[PDB]
Amino acid sequence: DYKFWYTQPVPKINDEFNESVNEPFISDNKVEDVRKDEYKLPPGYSWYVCDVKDEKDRSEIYTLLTDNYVEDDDNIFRFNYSAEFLLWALTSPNYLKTWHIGVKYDASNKLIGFISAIPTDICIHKRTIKMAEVNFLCVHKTLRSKRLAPVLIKEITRRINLENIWQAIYTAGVYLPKPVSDARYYHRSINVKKLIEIGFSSLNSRLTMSRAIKLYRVEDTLNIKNMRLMKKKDVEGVHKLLGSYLEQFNLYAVFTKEEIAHWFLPIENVIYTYVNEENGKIKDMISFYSLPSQILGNDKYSTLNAAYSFYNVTTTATFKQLMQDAILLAKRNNFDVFNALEVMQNKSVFEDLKFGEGDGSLKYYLYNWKCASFAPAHVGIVLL
Ligand SMILES: CCCCCCCCCCCCCC(=O)SCCNC(=O)CCNC(=O)[C@H](O)C(C)(C)COP(=O)(O)OP(=O)(O)OC[C@H]1O[C@@H](n2cnc3c(N)ncnc32)[C@H](O)[C@@H]1OP(=O)(O)O
Numbered sequence: 001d002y003k004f005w006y007t008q009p010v011p012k013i014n015d016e017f018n019e020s021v022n023e024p025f026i027s028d029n030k031v032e033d034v035r036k037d038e039y040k041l042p043p044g045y046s047w048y049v050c051d052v053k054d055e056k057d058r059s060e061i062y063t064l065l066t067d068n069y070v071e072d073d074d075n076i077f078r079f080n081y082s083a084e085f086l087l088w089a090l091t092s093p094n095y096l097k098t099w100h101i102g103v104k105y106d107a108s109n110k111l112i113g114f115i116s117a118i119p120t121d122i123c124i125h126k127r128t129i130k131m132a133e134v135n136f137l138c139v140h141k142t143l144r145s146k147r148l149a150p151v152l153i154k155e156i157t158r159r160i161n162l163e164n165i166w167q168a169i170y171t172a173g174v175y176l177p178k179p180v181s182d183a184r185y186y187h188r189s190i191n192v193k194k195l196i197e198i199g200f201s202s203l204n205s206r207l208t209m210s211r212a213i214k215l216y217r218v219e220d221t222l223n224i225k226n227m228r229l230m231k232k233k234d235v236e237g238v239h240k241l242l243g244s245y246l247e248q249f250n251l252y253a254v255f256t257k258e259e260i261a262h263w264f265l266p267i268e269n270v271i272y273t274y275v276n277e278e279n280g281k282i283k284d285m286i287s288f289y290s291l292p293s294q295i296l297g298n299d300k301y302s303t304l305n306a307a308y309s310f311y312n313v314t315t316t317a318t319f320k321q322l323m324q325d326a327i328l329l330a331k332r333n334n335f336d337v338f339n340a341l342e343v344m345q346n347k348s349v350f351e352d353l354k355f356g357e358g359d360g361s362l363k364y365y366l367y368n369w370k371c372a373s374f375a376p377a378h379v380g381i382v383l384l
């Protein structure tokens with residue numbers, strides 16, 4: 001029924017717009033009219049403004065997500081974003097602390113719910129709009145299906161609207177009204193044996209354990225020999241290479257130089273960016289972020305270490321050669337699996353690089369924006 005979502009400025013399930021339509025559902029909004037009162041929570045619960053730069057507040061959000069965030073549909077895995085990752089994801093340029101919103105249970109003083117947004121310029125069908133990127137919506141497992149999530153959504157919407165921002169971008173694995181695009185994810189095994197042992201990958205009469213290990217073996221030599229960790233000096237070149245590449249897509253962030261520095265400069269166990277510099281110019285880049293999943297109820301292993309493809313651009317090799325190098329660099333950094341969506345040019349390399357199709361898809365959404373939907377090869381953004 002989508003009783004909440006149908007009250008919002010998003011498409012109805014049967015809405016379909018042609019390419020001539022690219023505009024808000026509701027225009028001419030006024031900051032002066034935005035509600036100044038916080039949304040009401042159930043008795044015994046309070047809003048809390050989280051300071052993600054404070055280790056202890058950050059640790060509280062970490063605990064909440066570690067125990068209560070996204071699981072696969074089979075409840076095999078739960079994402080385990082690290083505390084340092086959450087710091088990086090939430091403190092990008094021009095972030096607002098007041099868009100990092102917790103809910104505590106007053107009697108215990110414990111965080112039981114969270115939602116966040118960061119500001120970003122988003123180009124949708126060639127029009128650039130200031131938007132909020134919404135992420136990390138979480139309600140404690142003990143409080144599910146009590147209609148807390150709409151309260152968190154309405155509260156962050158209000159706080160974003162105070163900043164004269166009337167559009168947002170968000171992704172989720174669940175189907176809601178109504179995706180602008182839908183991208184399946186794919187997985188390239190690196191540590192075959194571990195993936196077999198936790199039930200992620202499978203063997204058969206033909207594909208024995210030794211044969212599976214041989215199938216996924218990689219040569220420890222880069223196609224692009226000088227591919228190296230990104231440094232501060234490379235910010236301008238990455239901004240140029242990536243900024244120009246992303247313009248071909250129907251949906252992408254318009255990164256400033258400060259944003260390139262934030263989103264790409266390497267942080268161990270968070271974000272890995274490699275570049276190929278020729279003549280002091282950056283001609284190729286690979287990036288992937290670290291997102292482990294807790295393995296629920298495996299005796300031997302507690303964590304699946306997974307690298308997630310982020311942004312990859314080549315001008316001196318084929319895309320297949322570049323992504324082969326990305327897999328090698330993820331292997332060199334101890335990742336068990338390399339995960340990618342069928343966005344950008346990714347799908348074209350999946351068969352040849354031995355990726356397997358996963359069990360689901362990630363849906364991309366816009367809030368308060370009507371436009372034509374499109375195939376995921378036309379998506380040029382990755383949300384964390
Ligand atoms: C201009 C600025 C605008 C800013 C805002 C832009 C919009 C941002 C939107 C948020 C983007 C988040 C991006 C991410 O972080 S995606 C990751 C979301 N997090 C998880 O999956 C973590 C594990 N699950 C949970 O913590 C809870 O199940 C959550 C909190 C997800 C729902 O709690 P609960 O299960 O206890 O349910 P309820 O009774 O309170 O609420 C039921 C209502 O909630 C709607 N629902 C359920 N899941 C989602 C979902 N993932 N996006 C949007 N809506 C969702 C659902 O359709 C129903 O509405 P309707 O079907 O009756 O209509």
Ligand SMILES: Cc1nn(C)c(C)c1CCOc1cc(F)ccc1-c1ccc2n[nH]c(CN(C)C)c2c1
Pocket residue numbers: 070071072073077078079135136171172173174185186293306308339340341358361362383384
């Ligand atoms: C492994 C694994 N562990 N878990 C917990 C899942 C869902 C998987 C399957 C692989 O999932 C993926 C694989 C990819 F290559 C890319 C994305 C996902 C994925 C799926 C569902 C999600 N819901 N919320 C987010 C977070 N963010 C984008 C809003 C999700 C991210």
Ligand SMILES: [Cl-]
Pocket residue numbers: 154
């Ligand atoms: Cl209301």
Ligand SMILES: [Mg+2]
Pocket residue numbers: 139143144145146147148149
């Ligand atoms: Mg609830």
